[PDB]
Design a protein around this ligand. Structure first.
Ligand SMILES: CCc1ccc2[nH]c(C)c(CC(=O)O)c2c1
Ligand SMILES: CCc1ccc2[nH]c(C)c(CC(=O)O)c2c1
Length: 115
């Protein structure tokens, strides 16, 4: 229920990113959460994803949409720091350094609006 940062301390989140660097070096550590004020979209089964570093952001948008099992009419947006990723056909590795959190995770939010 509670957001990831309310379930793990800063030090623990950093240690998890370090573990992922050692055990899955070619993956980007990603946290994907439903927007707090979201009414239309369901909650994802899981929140922590290890994304192969060559995957395009625009492809991740399509993957998460499929995982939510929506109907074709439902609006869906996947945002990194409030930037919609739908047309970002750039590898996740290339945005990781600039957009990552201080803990080393890359945080994303999904919603039925882009504000
Ligand atoms: C949503 C996470 C994600 C996104 C894109 C991906 N493309 C491939 C080949 C994998 C395999 C894997 O899970 O390592 C993968 C995982
Ligand atoms: C997360 C910041 C960021 C990183 C890479 C990006 N590449 C493109 C085309 C955009 C604009 C957009 O969001 O449409 C963008 C934004």
């Amino acid at each position: 229920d509670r957001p990831f940062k309310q379930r793990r301390s800063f030090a623990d989140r950093c240690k998890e990113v370090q573990q992922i660097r050692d055990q899955h070096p070619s993956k980007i550590p990603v946290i994907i959460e439903r927007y707090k004020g979201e009414k239309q979209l369901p909650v994802l089964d899981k929140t922590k994803f290890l994304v192969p570093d060559h995957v395009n952001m625009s492809e991740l948008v399509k993957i998460i949409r499929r995982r939510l099992q929506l109907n074709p009419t439902q609006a869906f947006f996947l945002l990194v720091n409030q930037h919609s990723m739908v047309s970002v056909s750039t590898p996740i590795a290339d945005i990781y350094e600039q957009e990552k959190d201080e803990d080393g995770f890359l945080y994303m939010v999904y919603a039925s609006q882009e504000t």
